[PDB]
Design a protein around this ligand. Structure first.
Ligand SMILES: OC[C@H]1O[C@@H](O[C@@H]2[C@@H](O)[C@H](O[C@@H]3[C@@H](O)[C@H](O[C@@H]4[C@@H](O)[C@H](O[C@@H]5[C@@H](O)[C@H](O)O[C@H](CO)[C@H]5O)O[C@H](CO)[C@H]4O)O[C@H](CO)[C@H]3O)O[C@H](CO)[C@H]2O)[C@H](O)[C@@H](O)[C@@H]1O
Ligand SMILES: OC[C@H]1O[C@@H](O[C@@H]2[C@@H](O)[C@H](O[C@@H]3[C@@H](O)[C@H](O[C@@H]4[C@@H](O)[C@H](O[C@@H]5[C@@H](O)[C@H](O)O[C@H](CO)[C@H]5O)O[C@H](CO)[C@H]4O)O[C@H](CO)[C@H]3O)O[C@H](CO)[C@H]2O)[C@H](O)[C@@H](O)[C@@H]1O
Lengths: 1038, 518
């Protein structure tokens, strides 16, 4: 369960971080570490500019860890040693789930040092606990003097840019106070900026050190008392020259300096004795809170209990994916992957009685993702905002683990789709607001003075942590939680969503996955989900320009630079919803079927001239963010075409399944009728033609008319329809898309293409100022792995998919030595204006590397298609836990963004991960694990009756010798298998004999066969079964 | 005339800088130093974001001088020593008017090290010359292997904020080329910003090392070949493990790294012998200029002549305040004060026949004035802008030293007074503009192809250095100065003045002093 590395000083460098989870009632902090020195670089609370230790990028962190990091000095009879400073001395490193412990065994000096790092859980003050222990291993008593601490503490109120630019002048505002009491307080004298709230800096950083007995120690805040004239912090000259006792009696600087924090004790150690110190470095907002926290003595039992609680927090958070296989590395990697997915997406929880809340979510950032600006909320019920794509992908399989979630995700991510098919980038954190009459009615058991403040605070929008903090600050320490629960329950959900920066062309495709994942658990709720009128529509902020005005002529030719008109800029604070009566009526509500029809219609009629790809007219590329110049070259993508085909097929199936009446708005109905007329007119011309222009002009005119009509406002009038006309129109659209895909396959070659880039040679200038193209000249693009990955989702026969797999294996995308799948072929022969991707060395970042996200997507598509043997063969070799830790240069339990391929010019870096962890492959691995342990469709519906069955597919190299395998089903019920041999148990080559169920009340049940239907299935889906025993091919042989 | 400090490592810290004057026909650079390590922190050309060595404030300069500064390693029979690393060993420091020399006398290893820093004067390429000498003081012949260089070179095109914030990601654009020729070229593969002029980064940083005989040496650009797994740059583990000869034969990284520049030689020193190295670290705008500069061999006589010229430049600039009193410290302080006043205000000179020009002026900034954003012009006739109060005060007694100035200062600083009594803060650098008919009349002794370009450039506003550079680039190497003198003489003075930020209430009082001094 723990990863151990020996002599990490001489190994390859890597960067990691603590999860930083403090529980429901704790204050989280962020801490990053590297495998050098004492393995701590920088940490702090909230975002940057509030860091106790100065933040550094990965290179500077590697270079300056041994000087600005934690320092420990020892003196044994006049000689000064420094642990974790020399790589020749043996040292070890352990990486826990939510902790970090290192040690060194110095046989020369005969002393052992051990350091433990963990975050303080479940306390009103966020801090970093640090435990240091020194053991005497010699044969004679020794006289030991110890000094341990941090050489540089950034005072509160100093911004990062100030520290890194104007540091010499910034020392005028620095000071340290409260030294006699043993609790130094680091803060600025006055506000650095020249604005109001002067002398209002009340928060500060504090450090406290105590031994087992609980008494605090006098700190040292002047670095000149330890290093003297040595300003490089390399030699403790002052410590060597003078005894420790003399140093504590000398006057220290307290102003106009960069303060430090060192604690020292004097002791004589008998053979076998030990000395232990405990430290707390944190940040508060006022001295009163700090004094109240230390109102009770802290001792060793408190710290060990806190450490056990911190470990148990993670061990219980990651208890829903517990498994048992042949190799423990597999289940350890599963738990780590689930933890990372929870950390990036957000752990679901049930708040109050009808609210769903997500905790631990954050804007991620680390020593390698230095371009991001991470931020965390330092209060109870920690949460944070994020992008659309990442949150949408991370919550794909959230329903399976938490059945009580229901359809919250589907509504949340379908209410963010605007009327023009685009969506805002930002998804801000949840907030709640309370009305007036309900607030005055609920508060009837409180004093008037408290009631006024409570009703004034509750009316304004707030977060649960802020509400709890206000409750505490108002009621003292003897309140009751029932009032808080009632206030949360009666509060009203507040809409969310921020426009962000721009419009992409791939954020809309990650919703059919949510729909299918939900339907795989509740097959009988399909009609209710489809015909539920609850979804709203997000209000558009910027409307895209017309195609004629989107073209700008330059010296290199005609380009597409202008994409949005600034004259129609909206305000990002007025309204976040769409109302009827052109913005003066009630909130508009649409059913899910209407949303699907609108998305299909809008994503249609956006095809390029040749009718193969989909134009990226939003000014941003698709999934591949490195090619940020493609939209300027009339770019198009085939992945969107494949996704559109799949969505249209699903919509056709849904329409043909449940007949009825479907209602759509007037503009959408007119758009559908016009598109149907255009298709009926030009279907014959589409079949036999190379370059299409009239069809493109007609569809673009219709789309522009609809978009301009619906942008300024939409009336509430609704037009009734049927299912047959919609089915026919969607069938025509699907036929057109299929013909376009066939044409693209014919043109491209043996492998389905992914991108296209057109060039218009001749254009006509219009009288109004627009530019009208006359013809398009398509140009080929290098192969991408995303193409086949998207194509495998389409419903084609097994032979074509097998041939495509063979072609991909034989092609250049398959790395030879590493036996992994790259992202793309050589880009050195394409245009130089593609973007930042052309400026990168091959085999590094997003250029001919091994991107784990796409590789895992391809493996998942192989598994879903039915190529079980090929999937097993490739997963045995391409999986992270099966890699060699020496070559990988990192713990095999952690993911990475990419792995350097053979194309990397430097041979020694070939086969090493980078960019830490928290990639997009976590959800892919979770889905692969679920579909490999339980099958595609555990629940089926027939004649309105539930059916439960298992179709697992486990490779031979995962079954233990005793032939027992266990996994967590619905995160509550444990399923134990019993395999009777060592072979691949692919579906069709085995038959289930019998199953045994164990109810939570002690009653048993035995169902012969493999199919269970009825109340037993209902209980299984409701989490009323504790354990199951499934036998395959009867008992197990030798 | 020189200040000598003994054991500067144990003394109180202070920050200083070289004057950075390259003469009339030189390219000035900026260099700051502290009294720690080898006494060089950061240097570069022009303003920030074009620094060969990363710029640091005073505190970071003190803290990181011994790691990112110049490093020298010695090996005497299997044992590696590092000069200027231990304060117990006796060392000395000398501060010249326009130079800096340090030395160390290690009686244990029996070797002496001397390092000399000065700016290259009067050349088309601005660079920092560095001379390193090692002398054997033992009684027996020794086998010495030397390595000397800079461990971190910022490639051209990397901004300061990028280096200090997104350094880990910025390593994707870094590369080093032209290693076989012995002239490494550090520049980015493509422009960092997402704007036009892609693949237009042509300038770069270069380093060249040669001995007395004049032959260049093969550089080392991969720091992993010297420090191996030690990323703190504190121990040369790779140097200790393997001989110098083996290192030069190993393949080196050239992309996706932070390049360095180390030069190594192998020699056997007889008692009393010595070994000397010469280095040049600078910045150019294109490879053609760098190749043309090295078209002729450089040797020891060239470097010593350049050093003498650099010293004589300052000694002649500060020759107008020479005095003789009881204490030499008084006259030395007088000369230093005059040099500082000239550096901040601007040395008057007579340009052409009726123009008055000020050189060496700059927007000052140093390791302690880190809030300022200093800037210098990297061309002939260097000049810079400044504030109103500082320039007005510095030119108070300018008439006494230069009688030919006359009443230029009075008119210049009284024409900046507005009708409401306030004045703009900024005083921009001088510029000249030429009309049409005069330009066409003057240019009658030149080919038409050159005439068109010259008359197109001269009409627009320009600076004398830009005019000289254009003259050179048009005429090759065989032009005449009479045409330049006539063009400058017939050019028209262009007004100057920038509003700045706001209105003070004390900038108007420093004019009666000018009137009384005149
Ligand atoms: O392919 C690899 C990855 O590429 C990424 O794209 C990178 C791209 O995101 C990056 O954009 C840069 C901006 O992030 C950067 O943002 C600036 C802020 O940093 C700055 O504020 C800071 C402030 O936070 C701090 O406290 O003080 C600093 C000093 O004052 C201050 O700088 O504010 C700026 C103005 O608001 C803001 O712009 O700005 C850079 C310059 O504009 C941007 O370049 O650029 C990288 C290099 O081009 C890209 O690699 C992708 O996002 C990833 O997905 C890829 O994996
Ligand atoms: O009493 C002692 C002395 O006090 C001085 O006053 C100081 C005052 O000048 C200073 O103002 C600060 C500004 O200088 C600072 O300027 C900012 C720029 O630095 C920044 O650009 C840089 C860029 O150059 C670099 O390449 O990248 C950096 C990272 O991206 C970027 O930061 O741009 C900013 C926006 O244009 C610009 O504002 O800004 C600070 C914040 O606004 C100012 O505070 O402040 C000091 C502290 O208050 C003052 O001490 C007097 O001038 C002296 O006479 C006194 O001796």
């Amino acid at each position: 369960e723990t990863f151990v590395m020996d002599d990490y000083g001489k190994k390859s460098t890597f960067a990691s971080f603590l999860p930083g989870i403090a529980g429901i009632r704790g204050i989280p902090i962020w801490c990053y570490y590297v495998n050098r020195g004492q393995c701590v670089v920088s940490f702090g609370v909230d975002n940057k500019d509030h860091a106790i230790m100065e933040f550094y990028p990965a290179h500077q962190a590697y270079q300056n860890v041994k000087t600005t990091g934690f320092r420990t000095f020892l003196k044994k009879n006049g000689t000064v040693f420094e642990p974790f400073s020399d790589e020749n001395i043996t040292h070890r490193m352990q990486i826990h789930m939510n902790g970090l412990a290192i040690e060194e065994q110095n046989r020369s000096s005969g002393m052992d040092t051990k350091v433990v790092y963990y975050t303080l859980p479940g306390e009103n003050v966020g801090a970093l606990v640090r435990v240091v222990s020194v053991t005497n291993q010699s044969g004679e008593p020794i006289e030991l003097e110890l000094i341990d601490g941090m050489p540089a503490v950034i005072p509160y109120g100093v911004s990062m840019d100030s520290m890194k630019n104007m540091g010499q002048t910034a020392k005028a505002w620095m000071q340290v106070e409260d030294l006699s009491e043993g609790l130094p307080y680091y803060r600025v004298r006055a506000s650095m900026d020249d604005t109001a709230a002067v002398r209002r800096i009340d928060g500060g950083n504090f450090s406290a050190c105590c031994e087992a007995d609980g008494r605090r120690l006098q700190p040292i805040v002047d670095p000149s008392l330890i290093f003297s004239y040595d300003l490089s912090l390399k030699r403790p000259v002052g410590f060597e020259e003078r005894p420790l006792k003399e140093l504590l009696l000398e006057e220290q600087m307290t102003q106009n300096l960069l303060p430090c924090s060192f604690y020292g004790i004097t002791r004589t150690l008998a053979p076998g004795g030990s000395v232990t110190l405990y430290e707390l470095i944190g940040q508060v907002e006022n001295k009163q809170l700090l004094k109240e926290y230390f109102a009770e003595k802290k001792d060793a039992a408190y710290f060990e209990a806190k450490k056990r609680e911190a470990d148990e927090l993670a061990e219980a958070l990651t208890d829903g994916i517990r498994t048992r296989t042949a190799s423990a590395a597999f289940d350890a990697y599963c738990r780590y992957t689930y933890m990372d997915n929870v950390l990036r997406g957000g752990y679901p929880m049930q708040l109050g009685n009808n609210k769903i809340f997500y905790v631990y979510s954050r804007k991620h950032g680390d020593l390698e993702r230095d371009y991001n600006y991470f931020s965390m909320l330092p209060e109870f019920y920690s949460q944070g905002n994020g992008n659309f794509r990442d949150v949408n992908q991370n919550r794909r399989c959230d329903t399976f683990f938490a059945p009580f979630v229901g359809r919250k995700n589907i509504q949340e991510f379908y209410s963010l789709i605007q009327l023009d098919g685009y969506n805002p980038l930002g998804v801000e954190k949840l907030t709640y607001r309370l009305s007036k009459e309900r607030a005055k009615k609920l508060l009837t058991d409180v004093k008037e003075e408290q009631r006024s403040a409570l009703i004034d605070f509750a009316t304004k929008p707030f977060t649960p942590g802020a509400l709890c903090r206000k409750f505490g600050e108002v009621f003292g320490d003897t309140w009751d939680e029932t009032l808080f629960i009632r206030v949360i329950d009666f509060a009203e959900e507040m809409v969310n969503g921020s426009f962000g920066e721009g419009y992409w062309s791939d954020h809309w495709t990650y919703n059919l996955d949510l729909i299918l994942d939900y339907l795989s658990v509740f097959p009988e709720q399909e009609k209710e989900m489809l015909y539920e009128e609850v979804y709203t529509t997000f209000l558009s902020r910027i409307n895209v320009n017309r195609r004629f005005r989107r073209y700008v002529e330059t010296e290199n030719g005609l380009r597409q630079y202008r994409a949005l008109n600034e004259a129609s800029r909206r305000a990002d604070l007025g309204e976040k919803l769409v109302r009827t009566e052109y913005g003066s009526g009630d909130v508009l509500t649409m059913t899910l079927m209407e949303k699907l029809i609108l998305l299909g219609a809008v994503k249609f009629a956006t095809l390029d001239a040749y009718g193969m790809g989909i134009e990226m007219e939003g000014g941003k590329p698709g999934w591949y963010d490195a090619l940020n110049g493609m939209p300027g070259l009339f770019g198009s993508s085939m992945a969107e075409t494949y996704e559109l085909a799949r969505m249209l097929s699903y919509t056709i199936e849904a329409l043909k399944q449940y007949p009825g009446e479907v209602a759509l708005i007037e503009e959408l109905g007119c758009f559908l009728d016009e598109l149907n007329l255009i298709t009926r007119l030009e279907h014959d011309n589409i079949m036999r033609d190379e370059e299409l222009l009239s069809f493109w002009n007609r569809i673009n005119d219709a789309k522009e008319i609809y978009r301009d009509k619906t942008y300024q406002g939409v009336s509430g009038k609704k037009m009734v329809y049927h299912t047959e006309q919609l089915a026919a129109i969607l069938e025509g659209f699907l036929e057109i898309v299929t013909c376009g895909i066939k044409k693209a396959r014919r043109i491209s070659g043996e492998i389905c293409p992914t991108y296209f880039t057109y060039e218009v040679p001749e254009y006509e200038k219009l009288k109004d100022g627009g530019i009208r193209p006359l013809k398009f000249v398509p140009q080929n693009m290098p192969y991408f792995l995303e193409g086949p990955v998207r194509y495998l989702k389409l419903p084609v026969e097994q032979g074509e998919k097998r041939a495509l797999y063979e072609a991909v294996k034989e092609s250049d995308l398959y790395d030879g030595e590493l036996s992994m799948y790259k992202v793309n072929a050589s880009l050195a022969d394409s245009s130089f204006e593609l973007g930042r991707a052309r400026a990168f060395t091959p085999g590094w970042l997003e250029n001919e590397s091994i991107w784990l996200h796409m590789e895992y997507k391809y493996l998942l598509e192989l598994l879903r298609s039915g190529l079980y043997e090929e999937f097993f063969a490739d997963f045995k070799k391409a999986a992270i836990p099966f890699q060699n830790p020496e070559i990988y240069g990192r713990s095999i339990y952690e993911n990475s963004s990419f792995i350097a391929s053979s194309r990397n010019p430097n041979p020694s870096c070939r086969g090493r991960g980078f960019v830490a962890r928290l990639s997009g492959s976590t959800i892919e691995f979770i889905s692969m694990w679920k579909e490999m342990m339980f099958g595609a469709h555990p629940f089926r519906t027939e004649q309105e009756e539930l059916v439960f069955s298992l179709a697992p597919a486990i490779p031979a190299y995962l079954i233990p010798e005793d032939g027992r395998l266990s996994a967590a089903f619905m995160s509550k019920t444990t399923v134990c298998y019993e395999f009777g041999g060592h072979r691949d148990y692919v579906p069709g080559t085995y038959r289930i004999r019998h199953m045994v169920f164990f109810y939570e009340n002690g009653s048993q049940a035995t169902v012969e066969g493999e199919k269970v239907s009825g109340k037993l299935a209902e209980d299984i889906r409701a989490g009323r079964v504790r354990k199951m025993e499934v036998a395959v091919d009867l008992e197990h042989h030798h």
